[PDB]
Design a protein around this nucleic acid. Structure first.
Ligand SMILES: [Mg+2]
Ligand SMILES: [Mg+2]
Ligand SMILES: [Mg+2]
Ligand SMILES: [Mg+2]
Ligand SMILES: [Mg+2]
Ligand SMILES: [Mg+2]
Ligand SMILES: [Mg+2]
Ligand SMILES: [Mg+2]
Ligand SMILES: [Mg+2]
Ligand SMILES: [Mg+2]
Ligand SMILES: [Mg+2]
Ligand SMILES: [Mg+2]
Ligand SMILES: [Mg+2]
Ligand SMILES: [Mg+2]
Ligand SMILES: [Mg+2]
Ligand SMILES: [Mg+2]
Ligand SMILES: [Mg+2]
Ligand SMILES: [Mg+2]
Ligand SMILES: [Mg+2]
Ligand SMILES: [Mg+2]
Ligand SMILES: [Mg+2]
Ligand SMILES: [Mg+2]
Ligand SMILES: [Mg+2]
Ligand SMILES: [Mg+2]
Ligand SMILES: [Mg+2]
Ligand SMILES: [Mg+2]
Ligand SMILES: [Mg+2]
Ligand SMILES: [Mg+2]
Ligand SMILES: [Mg+2]
Ligand SMILES: [Mg+2]
Ligand SMILES: [Mg+2]
Ligand SMILES: [Mg+2]
Ligand SMILES: [Mg+2]
Ligand SMILES: [Mg+2]
Ligand SMILES: [Mg+2]
Ligand SMILES: [Mg+2]
Ligand SMILES: [Mg+2]
Ligand SMILES: [Mg+2]
Ligand SMILES: [Mg+2]
Ligand SMILES: [Mg+2]
Ligand SMILES: [Mg+2]
Ligand SMILES: [Mg+2]
Ligand SMILES: [Mg+2]
Ligand SMILES: [Mg+2]
Ligand SMILES: [Mg+2]
Ligand SMILES: [Mg+2]
Ligand SMILES: [Mg+2]
Ligand SMILES: [Mg+2]
Ligand SMILES: [Mg+2]
Ligand SMILES: [Mg+2]
Ligand SMILES: [Mg+2]
Ligand SMILES: [Mg+2]
Ligand SMILES: [Mg+2]
Ligand SMILES: [Mg+2]
Ligand SMILES: [Mg+2]
Ligand SMILES: [Mg+2]
Ligand SMILES: [Mg+2]
Ligand SMILES: [Mg+2]
Ligand SMILES: [Mg+2]
Ligand SMILES: [Mg+2]
Ligand SMILES: [Mg+2]
Ligand SMILES: [Mg+2]
Ligand SMILES: [Mg+2]
Lengths: 207, 144, 62, 124
RNA sequence: UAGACGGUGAGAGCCCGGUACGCGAAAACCCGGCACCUGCCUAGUAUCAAUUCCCGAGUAGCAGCGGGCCCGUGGAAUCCGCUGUGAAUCCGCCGGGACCACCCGGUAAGCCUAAAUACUCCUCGAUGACCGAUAGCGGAUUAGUACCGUGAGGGAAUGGUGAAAAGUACCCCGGGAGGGGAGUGAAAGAGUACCUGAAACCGUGUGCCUACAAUCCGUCAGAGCCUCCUUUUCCUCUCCGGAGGAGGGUGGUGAUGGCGUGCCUUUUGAAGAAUGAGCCUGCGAGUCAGGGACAUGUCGCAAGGUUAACCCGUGUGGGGUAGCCGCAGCGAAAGCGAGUCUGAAUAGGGCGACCCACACGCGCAUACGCGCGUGUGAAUAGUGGCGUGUUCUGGACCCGAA
RNA sequence: AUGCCGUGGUGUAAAGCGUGGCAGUGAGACGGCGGGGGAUAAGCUCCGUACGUCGAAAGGGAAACAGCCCAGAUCGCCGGC
RNA sequence: CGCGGCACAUCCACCUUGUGGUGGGUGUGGGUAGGGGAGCGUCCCUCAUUCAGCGAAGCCACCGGGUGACCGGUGGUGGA
């Protein structure tokens, strides 16, 4: 309900009040399983392909006369029972995106962020590096003062570039913009670390 | 905390697909067809009744014509006015769209089903004959 | 694609307010001199499509 | 995902061929012919587990009948005599006493012969 | 600011090529600026007049025959061709679905025109709940090659030693091939016939059975023999050893007795002398698209539900009300509307709405419940996702003609 | 005589009915009893039968033997009727 | 019929008194076309976790387990 804001190399300056209609929502698991499935279904590429019997090279003529040879009648050399023939019902390029409604997408995101806020997993900071040039060493030590856990979602504003560069190649740290929060990256994370500008922009976009 | 390995669908939502033609312990060789005739390799069209004159040619056509220039109204009942506006006042076409009684961009028409007990003052198109009665008998007016 | 409805069946069947499917009745267009008025009044109007035809007629209308 | 078939398909092939060890010809060597014979072998086995309950009874009755005729009675009136005397020993053990202890089988005939009615041909 | 990816003697951010990030161009090409240079313009304007002239010609229109429009010649407009006939310059002409009148709209028979859209032989940079050598391109290999055909054409098969070639010096048998010993290597249980090395199939050795018996070749009953472990005194060398026998137990085999008509397909009925199958290994058949259709499971919102193209973002995120479905029906329709069509009907019938399970009460009815308020607070509803079944249109489960 | 329709009792779980989803089948065979065609022949052919079995039914009997007689196999037992 | 195991329907009891579970009766459980229900094995991806040059896969053999598809252990071979 109330998150104290900490500073890089320092102490608590202020606090943010999380609104209860956005961070204290009861979590629907059947709803979150549908949204997380639909995002990984949209994440696919679907570039898998085979050839049918009409698309394998050659195979136009009838290879011998139908009656009088003592062989089974065949009709084409690229039938699917042959070696080198076309695939029957094989893969073709598909798109797997789904049509999950807007209210179901927004409710799963609130239900995942409510579960982190209910467990003390939301952290508010002012910035990652306290200067203007990036430094992974100083930014790693500051996240270790917050967390001891392997998966960390850092939500910082897109204009802030020195903070984003400072936590890029840290393993187990995912960066995204405040208007790109979704259910998969929040349920993968153990600790969601907002910036003070990033958390105020998420609340103001949802009142 | 809920993690990605704690999510599972609602019971009964995801059911298994029937894979047909995969041995004798399931739907076996013929995959539910059984026959040796048309239904064993092809579909039969719905319009075909074996050769006699079908139901969509035995019967006569429905009589009449469609009016090309037919105007259509979106309908609101005066009993719905009593529930939507329990204080009375002016009721326009824009006031009925926001209250969900009627669709956008269409001519409205008040009908007289229900009990109007409030003092409303409603502007619309084409009042019903029993709707002009109940509006004035409740204390209001109805103009075009 | 998109399912095309059946043109000849939509000229012969329609739906009521509750969802019944109604039709008109045959033996009425011509040869009407030897038919008494007890018969043309029986063949007048509309009746509901019988239960043994309602599955195939509903799929022609859809 | 293209799936090769062999890791799954060889599972039932190895087990059919182990159940057919000791068959002669193609019936221990080839999977298609070992499997036709396992269909008959497990029907024959089912058929014979229910048949040997009658086969052993057919063996026991033959030995009770042989031992009773040594003690000048038939199998026929011996079974009437033991039902009349209330001796509920079954034919499995009555053909086992007849071999290992012939004196006790003579003591059972005298119980069966005494309980038998005076004229067996007279009506009940 | 680098934990991309690959290499390196086995899972490397710190060993190598790189990566993040930055730096770089003689000349040619491309793009742009500024100059040269090249063109264009500097006399019209305004008011009034209706007197005249002009406003795209073998054209429009008309007719015959055709083509195409939702429109298959129809009452057939608008648009195009061929044949005949053939105007008018604004009071003109053409269109507004035969046609006429009024009215509205526009000025055919001259020309040019960017962007929004389509495509990828090819270049560069990436990517995959794509393939991994019968797959994936026909082509990882002489590949459109070898080969087949007079020709147009058709059209294959063929990858892997090891980290390193250190690819076995030397000796022996042999004409060689091949081997044996040595030696190399972590391993030749990796030796250019080379990673792993399955089955069919082919030998050699060994245990049991079999040369007087009629066998869908198995199954149940069952003796003996062979093998390897164990219970009771004995060889008690006794910790030994199990040394031999007796009992039990595995594993192999099966003298002998009974029972016993292959599998598939297709049929009234097949062991059938009906069909298919020599054998093994590998491959070979209900799939996919779509805000489709009907029905259901399930989730979200709910008298509402939901967006499409599109827009913005590193993405699966946020916008986007056009639309669709629900919201009142009845009627050929005009129409009227909890009703409405038919009808002369205040007749009946069709279709459609319509609660008594109930407190008080109102003229009340044996107590019953007809009508209406406050509910006693009656019992319902749609729509968008995702499963699944059927289905429509597509090759539509797969193979097969003449 | 049976059969058929109605009704009142009594009995009887897996009867009946309405409306949806998905079917398959629409070549039958012999046996009993009644009839047609045929020569009152056919392992003939065509109908009737709250008749039966096979089809799709293993087990026991009929020497063998889909359709006849007995009996309907959840599995195990070296029990009994 | 007897004794023992399993399954399904129904009834009777209860434990959040059907989303179900446990217990006790009675009944039922041949089956082609076909309908409904519930599962085994192969492969790929995601999250979590755990093995592996002190030997992964694959293969071979022996010993065992399950109501079925099938599984597990141990050893030999082998090299990720
Ligand atoms: Mg072709
Ligand atoms: Mg062909
Ligand atoms: Mg291919
Ligand atoms: Mg969206
Ligand atoms: Mg699917
Ligand atoms: Mg088959
Ligand atoms: Mg078939
Ligand atoms: Mg059929
Ligand atoms: Mg005809
Ligand atoms: Mg008429
Ligand atoms: Mg008349
Ligand atoms: Mg043998
Ligand atoms: Mg018996
Ligand atoms: Mg790497
Ligand atoms: Mg480097
Ligand atoms: Mg002009
Ligand atoms: Mg013309
Ligand atoms: Mg035309
Ligand atoms: Mg001309
Ligand atoms: Mg007009
Ligand atoms: Mg012009
Ligand atoms: Mg042009
Ligand atoms: Mg253009
Ligand atoms: Mg391009
Ligand atoms: Mg490329
Ligand atoms: Mg190839
Ligand atoms: Mg040549
Ligand atoms: Mg040598
Ligand atoms: Mg050597
Ligand atoms: Mg060495
Ligand atoms: Mg090795
Ligand atoms: Mg070799
Ligand atoms: Mg090898
Ligand atoms: Mg002999
Ligand atoms: Mg004989
Ligand atoms: Mg025949
Ligand atoms: Mg049949
Ligand atoms: Mg044959
Ligand atoms: Mg034969
Ligand atoms: Mg043959
Ligand atoms: Mg209507
Ligand atoms: Mg009426
Ligand atoms: Mg719903
Ligand atoms: Mg039904
Ligand atoms: Mg017939
Ligand atoms: Mg047939
Ligand atoms: Mg018949
Ligand atoms: Mg007869
Ligand atoms: Mg006959
Ligand atoms: Mg008969
Ligand atoms: Mg039988
Ligand atoms: Mg039966
Ligand atoms: Mg029999
Ligand atoms: Mg017999
Ligand atoms: Mg008896
Ligand atoms: Mg039974
Ligand atoms: Mg059954
Ligand atoms: Mg079946
Ligand atoms: Mg080893
Ligand atoms: Mg694998
Ligand atoms: Mg195994
Ligand atoms: Mg192992
Ligand atoms: Mg192994």
């Amino acid at each position: 309900l109330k998150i104290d804001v900490k500073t890089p190399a320092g102490k608590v300056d202020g606090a943010i009040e999380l609104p209860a209609e956005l961070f204290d929502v009861p979590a629907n698991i059947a709803l979150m399983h549908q949204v997380v499935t639909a995002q990984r279904a949209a994440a696919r590429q679907g570039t898998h392909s085979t050839k049918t019997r009409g698309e394998v090279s050659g195979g136009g003529r009838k290879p011998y006369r139908q009656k009088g040879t003592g062989r089974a009648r065949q009709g084409s050399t690229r039938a699917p029972q042959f070696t080198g023939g076309g695939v029957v019902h094989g893969p073709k390029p598909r798109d797997y995106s789904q049509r999950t409604p807007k209210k179901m997408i927004a409710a799963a995101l609130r239900g995942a962020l409510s579960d982190r806020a209910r467990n003390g997993r939301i952290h508010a900071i002012t910035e990652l590096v306290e200067g203007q040039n990036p430094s992974t060493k100083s930014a790693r030590a500051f996240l270790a003062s917050l967390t001891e856990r392997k998966q960390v979602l850092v939500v910082i504003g897109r204009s802030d570039e020195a903070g984003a560069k400072s936590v890029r190649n840290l393993p187990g740290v995912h960066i995204l913009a405040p208007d790109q929060l979704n259910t998969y990256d929040v349920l993968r994370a153990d600790d969601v670390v907002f910036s003070v500008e990033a958390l105020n922009a998420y609340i103001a976009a949802n009142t | 905390t809920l993690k990605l390995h704690d999510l599972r669908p609602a019971r009964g939502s995801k059911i298994a697909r029937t894979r047909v033609g995969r041995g004798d312990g399931s739907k076996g060789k013929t995959a539910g067809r059984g026959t040796k005739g048309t239904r064993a390799r092809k579909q039969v069209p719905v319009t075909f009744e074996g050769g006699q004159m079908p139901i969509h040619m035995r019967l006569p056509k429905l009589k009449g014509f469609r009016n090309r220039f037919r105007t259509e109204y979106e309908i609101v009942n005066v009993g719905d006015i009593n529930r939507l506006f329990p204080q009375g006042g002016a009721v326009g076409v824009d006031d009925l769209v926001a209250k969900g009684a009627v669709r956008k961009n269409a001519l409205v028409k008040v009908l007289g089903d229900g009990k109007l007990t409030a003092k409303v003052d409603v502007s619309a198109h084409k009042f019903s004959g029993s709707a002009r009665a109940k509006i004035t008998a409740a204390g209001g007016s109805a103009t075009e | 694609p998109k399912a095309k409805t059946h043109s000849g069946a939509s000229k012969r069947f329609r739906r009521t307010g509750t969802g019944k499917i109604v039709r008109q009745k045959a033996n009425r267009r011509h040869l009407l001199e030897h038919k008494p008025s007890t018969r043309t009044r029986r063949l007048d109007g509309r009746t509901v499509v019988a239960a043994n035809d309602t599955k195939r007629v509903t799929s022609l209308l859809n | 995902a293209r799936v090769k078939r062999a890791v799954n398909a060889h599972k039932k092939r190895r087990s059919i061929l182990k159940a057919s060890r000791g068959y002669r010809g193609q019936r221990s060597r080839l999977y298609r012919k070992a499997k036709e014979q396992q269909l008959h072998s497990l029907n024959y086995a089912y058929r014979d587990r229910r048949a040997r309950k009658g086969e052993f009874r057919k063996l026991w009755i033959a030995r009770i009948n042989a031992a009773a005729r040594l003690n000048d009675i038939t199998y026929n009136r011996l079974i009437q005599g033991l039902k009349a005397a209330g001796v509920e020993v079954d034919r499995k053990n009555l053909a086992d006493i007849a071999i290992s202890d012939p004196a006790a089988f003579t003591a059972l005939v005298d119980v069966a012969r005494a309980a038998l009615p005076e004229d067996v041909n007279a009506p009940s």
